[PDB]
């Protein structure tokens, strides 16, 4: 039959993009949703409608907590109990929000936001997929800007760093059991639904190749390359889809 | 007067060596501790005795908990109250063990995470708040892209702390706030580990066969506290015998 | 028409089955070489057969010295004598020997491995881009550079000053729609020579599956780099180590 | 007696501040130059002054040919001439100038410079230092922008990508011999003679500490670390001098 992926964060931008593309490579997909339900029910109605039974959703807060654990251990059962197997994991769900370290939510909400979805939910995901255990791998989003960041963004930076530390840690401890551990790092790709068009152009008009975001399409065609085939020797690689920008100097 | 550092885990191996070095360069010094009061109070002795009323301690847990801001708050305090200023902060308390991905979880994330990378975040807040040659130096690891097996959550915490090292850098630079790294390699050996265990990762190390020493490690947070690093912030220093360059 | 693609040292191993599989996608290749004339003609009888007039050899010695530039100018200018155009160069020629820093002259050394694995992409980038719709270019690392063999410092300097090249040209041709990009093997072919108790020993330290790579493992990441599926992806290194790169002493 | 320390490139500018600088700790200098005699024999009068019999100077041209490996060998053959020993080697010399990919030197006439002083100099130099063998070590003069590079100056990093391969290379291979490799990376420091006042305040306001240029003594302190008792483990290791430069995004 089959695969199976889950995708986190996937109802909408770059995770929906990601789930798209595997569900016309011939994945069934899990769509884990937090506050986006509409978003995710039209998404995999939609699905659903191109083949049936390949599409669920599954609710899931991933900020960290003591209940984390649980959660991410659901979505992937939500996973086997909808399709039988689970062969794809994406960390893709990211909150994403300036904590100046010189200054409505409390510090402790914002770490466990930032590094709860960021990088805690992505290693509690991978211990699940690995531990409820063909081509079995994971991708996570990670950042290609993360060593150069935004002023005032340290938790969020903070977490990214530590998912690649997560995909490296994970990429050598799962290898054994034929998982692959990879990372995608986008520079600017769509951009925040918030920012305003003369924000969203000087971001623009940093990118070398071309002056412009990356596609969503463009994220998820390098996740679908390190879950192929075509990638089998691939573990523990981060794949920047940035149009140069990390290379642009100050 | 003279300047004053916190040392966080200050009381044993390299936060100790850390301390002593600082002191000796004219610190007065915070001893921070959390479950060492007796070699806290034992090292902030044979400081003061050296020289008087120029070393204190300050006991703090430094795990994850609605509560670690303002025990990150209280370790700077302290520095302010007792020595009118806090010129430097060594982030050097780490918790390490593995966490297989095939203590429950969340407590190995407060440990894990918190102390090796947001109590870091929020004592880096409470001294740039309360804010000359200012710096802070965290204690990073030079074997974070060649990790040990089932060490992920360290792993992920030492690389947490790469971030915050370069964020802060970046964003407490107009305060004239220097922020930069210290990654030891193979230094004291954790005591739980064998010496057959150990001998064996001497025998790894390019530069002579041994591990660091504590002050090897102390020797490189000094020069970045130094005025000959004034233009030094966002810099990791490796301290590990060339360990990291050694293929597998 | 059919797109076209340079690839250095192509008769055998990696560079063969890149220009192979360049090949299968539908490009016109030039195989280049420098001893090995018997196995790139055989590769470019192969190719033809597939497809008549698809496939060109092209021998240059890519050792540095005073001639190198015109070399490679001549190299990039067979590709449009026989195609027409020149839509994608994969430096993946490499000289590859021990250099200790305490039976070739040093500086004879210093040509070969300098020369193959760095001044040569170079020359090849300026002659690519002069003569200048998804151009790129692939750049063959070493995943395994900041980790390096014993004694190896001249090889070790020659592939670090690739991926310099590798960022510095994708910077500057972004503007002309080329990109550039690296793909950074582990082990994958072992010499044919070497005992297989040694090849084992390289083996047993890959987390992935305790084997080297493939040469098509390799070329399957030059095609995504030079595909439509990478159209956004310049100045990106794709390690292809099967994790080797993460394993501690 | 005092050590001996080779310093390249040491007539005028950051070279200079790391002879000074050396020499004022107690070592013995080689100033080695190129094209500044008069300032090479200023600098060496002054040092000597200081301390009568300390401070030599030694002529050559780095660029890459099929001689400059004798004329490496003879500049350390120079401090052992001077001085009986050789301690320190500095590999501060560079040439640095645009080498655009797309258009009156020729391009072989640039690679020789460009790769010969960056890159294949040190590393000969690295040799020779090597073959003539306390507290030895070797510091590269590296770039703290070379993974961020300027627009047209490929040659000039590559070579200093070469520079940092060298670092490690050697590093690796030279602790048996209990000699220490590492580099100090400044970003932007004392700025080209060639370059006018507004574009030299341009640089100056992208450095997060200070919005102001290293001073070539602030460049020397960290060499003087590496070079020091308290650096004794330290190998393989480059020191960025940057004023956080390099972690700034476009
Ligand atoms: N866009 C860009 O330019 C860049 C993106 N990336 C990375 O790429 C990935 C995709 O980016 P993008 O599509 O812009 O991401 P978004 O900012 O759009 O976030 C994706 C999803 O994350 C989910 N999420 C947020 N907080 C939580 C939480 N507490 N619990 C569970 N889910 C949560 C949301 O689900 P819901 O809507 O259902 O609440 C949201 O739709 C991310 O990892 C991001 O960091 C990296 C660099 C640049
Ligand atoms: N040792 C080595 O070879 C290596 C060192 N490092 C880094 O070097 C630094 C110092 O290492 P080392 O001296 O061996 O450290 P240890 O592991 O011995 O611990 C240092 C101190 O941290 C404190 N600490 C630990 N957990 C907590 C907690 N939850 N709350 C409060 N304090 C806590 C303890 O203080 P108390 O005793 O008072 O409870 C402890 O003595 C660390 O940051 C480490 O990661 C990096 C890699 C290798
Ligand atoms: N194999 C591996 O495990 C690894 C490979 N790589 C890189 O991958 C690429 C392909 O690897 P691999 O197939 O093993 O390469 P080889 O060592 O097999 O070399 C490829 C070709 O390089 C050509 N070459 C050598 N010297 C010169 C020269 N002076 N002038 C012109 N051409 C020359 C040769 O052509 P001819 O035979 O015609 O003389 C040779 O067949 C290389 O860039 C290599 O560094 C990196 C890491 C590991
Ligand atoms: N200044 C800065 O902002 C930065 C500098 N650096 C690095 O730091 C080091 C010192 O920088 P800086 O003082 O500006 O360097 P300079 O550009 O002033 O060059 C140093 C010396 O190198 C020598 N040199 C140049 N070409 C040759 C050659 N063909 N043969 C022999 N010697 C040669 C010259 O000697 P002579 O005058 O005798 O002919 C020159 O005085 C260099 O390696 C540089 O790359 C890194 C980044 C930033
Ligand atoms: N979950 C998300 N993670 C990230 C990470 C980076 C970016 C991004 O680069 N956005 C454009 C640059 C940007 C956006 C907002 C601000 Br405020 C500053 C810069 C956007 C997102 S959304
Ligand atoms: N041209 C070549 N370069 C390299 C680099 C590494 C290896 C190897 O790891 N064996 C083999 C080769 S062959
Ligand atoms: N030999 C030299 N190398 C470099 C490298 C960088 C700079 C620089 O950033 N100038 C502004 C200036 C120089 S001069």
Known sequence: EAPAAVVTGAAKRIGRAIAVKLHQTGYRVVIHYHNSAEAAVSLADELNKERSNTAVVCQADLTNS????????????????????????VNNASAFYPTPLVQGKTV?????????????????????????????????????????PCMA????????????????????????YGIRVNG??????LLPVAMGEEEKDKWRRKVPLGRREASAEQIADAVIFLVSGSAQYITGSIIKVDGGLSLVHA
Chains 1, 4 share one sequence.
């Open 184 to 189: 995608v790092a986008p520079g600017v790709s």
């Open 108 to 148: 402790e909400t914002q770490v466990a936001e930032l590094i709860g979805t960021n990088a805690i939910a992505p290693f509690l995901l991978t211990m699940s997929f690995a531990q409820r255990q063909s081509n079995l791998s994971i991708v996570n989003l990670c950042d290609a800007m993360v060593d150069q």
């Open 153 to 176: 963004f340290s938790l969020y930076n903070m977490g990214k760093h530590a998912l690649v530390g997560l995909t490296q840690s994970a990429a050598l401890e799962l290898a054994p």
């Open 66 to 89: 003591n209940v984390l654990p649980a959660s991410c251990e659901e979505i992937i059962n939500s996973c086997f109990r909808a399709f039988g197997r689970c062969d794809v994991l």
